[PDB]
Amino acid sequence: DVPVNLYRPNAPFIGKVISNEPLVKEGGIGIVQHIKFDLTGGNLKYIEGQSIGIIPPGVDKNGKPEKLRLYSIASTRHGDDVDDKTISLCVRQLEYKHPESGETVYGVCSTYLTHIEPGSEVKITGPVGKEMLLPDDPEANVIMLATGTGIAPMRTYLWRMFKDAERAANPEYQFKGFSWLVFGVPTTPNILYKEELEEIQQKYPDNFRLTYAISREQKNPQGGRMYIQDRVAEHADQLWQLIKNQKTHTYICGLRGMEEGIDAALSAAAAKEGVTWSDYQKDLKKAGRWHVATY
Ligand SMILES: Cc1cc2nc3c(=O)[nH]c(=O)nc-3n(C[C@H](O)[C@H](O)[C@H](O)COP(=O)(O)OP(=O)(O)OC[C@H]3O[C@@H](n4cnc5c(N)ncnc54)[C@H](O)[C@@H]3O)c2cc1C
């Protein structure tokens, strides 16, 4: 029933860019774009928490055709306009500099995507992934631990749970559990989808909690910059108490490196009740209730 690999890299779906909109506001670090593609003419279907591949044009430094890069889907199954016609991505332009070249180096696929014009044709593959799926149970609790573009799957969950047009389109999923997003970014300008996330918490104060870790604006209790691992530590008991529920799912997404601190915080919380978190987490993983996609 889960859609997978309706298109493959040997014969991709050629979609058209509808829009390319900035998500980083003035004063922010870097470039993150919300990109919506037209799926009409093909049969690419997908659900929340999945990814698609993008094949950028050109050859690599060895003259080989560029391979696909995976991007978390940022829209629900219905698309941003709830019409079942589009799919959206949340793409950061990769930029770093030296012990890999010259000065500033720009990622191939991400630079291609962030600068792409409406009307352009794009090679799309997928969808892919079954490890970040949202439960059908409307009484599930959902913890979301995201940094940067790791917000993308979280957006698909939250929009499905809480958007007016989504609730109207999805008779059989009227979310009534509790969801908690802890989202780490460097600045307030860098809070991707800020306005809509805060609008959701305002209309559903009992079903959605929003916690920021803003590194350039906040310090942890030890005086370092505030990161997501610091907020999880700050709320470790609360998060552990939620995780003990048989219906609670946790999702972690973003660039690698977050998980070690999250585990240390939850390990100290669980230890207070004689539970070794690493073991409990293994069982959660097996049960399909601990979801991770880092990159
Ligand atoms: C399941 C999954 C989902 C993803 N979802 C998203 C998403 O929603 N949004 C998003 O923006 N990205 C996402 N990514 C990452 C994305 O696929 C691409 O890896 C990323 O966009 C960079 O690709 P590129 O073509 O721009 O870079 P490339 O041109 O391939 O550059 C990357 C290469 O350069 C090197 N490199 C990268 N960073 C550094 C650094 N700091 N220092 C030194 N060398 C470095 C490495 O060799 C790396 O392989 C996801 C990845 C996966 C696996």
Q: May I ask the CATH class of domain 129-295?
A: alpha beta
Question: Which residues have C-beta within 8 Å of that of residue 283, sequence separation ≥ 6?
Answer: none
Domain boundaries, the chain: 1-128, 129-295
Neighbours of 246 (CB within 10 A): 8
- Tell me, using a 6 A CB cutoff, whether residue 20 lines ligand 1: no
Dihedral angle sign, alpha carbons of residues 271, 276, 282, 288: negative
**Rounded (10°) CA dihedral 3, 91, 226, 259:** 40
Domains 1-128 and 129-295 share a fold: no
**CA 60 and chain centroid, separation:** 28
| Radius of gyration of the chain measured on its C-alpha atoms | 19
CA distance 86 to 54: 15
Which segments within the chain are labelled E, that is strand? 13-22, 32-38, 51-55, 69-72, 86-92, 95-96, 105-106, 121-128, 141-147, 179-185, 208-214, 248-254, 290-294
Method by which the coordinates were obtained: X-ray
Identity of residue 272: K
Atom of ligand 1 nearest to the CA of 128: 1
| 43: its two tokens | 């049969």
139 DSSP 8-state letter: T
Instruction: Calculate how far, in angstroms, residue 217's C-alpha sits from the geometric centre of ligand 1.
Output: 26
The Cα–Cα gap between 114 and 95 comes to 12
Pairing mode, strands 32-38 and 13-22: antiparallel
Q: In this structure, what token pair is assigned to residue 114?
A: 């962030």
Who contacts 70 (Cβ-Cβ below 8 Å, separation ≥6)? 51, 52, 53, 128, 295
| Helices and strands of the chain, counted as H and E runs | 8, 13
CB atoms within 10 A of CB 32: 22
Give which of 237, 232, 48 is closest to 145, Cα–Cα.
232
Nearest to 13 by CA among 47, 40, 51: 40
The number of angstroms, rounded, from the C-alpha of 253 to the middle of its chain's C-alpha atoms is: 6
31, 59, 60, 69, best to mutate for ligand 1 pocket (most atoms within 8 Å of CB): 69
Task: Give the C-alpha separation, 82 to 158, whole Å.
Answer: 14
Q: Say which CATH architecture domain 1-128 belongs to.
A: Beta Barrel (2.40)
Q: Which of 74, 76, 145, 83 is nearest to 113 (CA)?
A: 74
Helix (H, G, I), strand (E, B) or coil at 100: coil
PDB resolution in Å: 1.8
How far apart (Å, rounded) are the C-alpha atoms in residues 70 and 94? 14
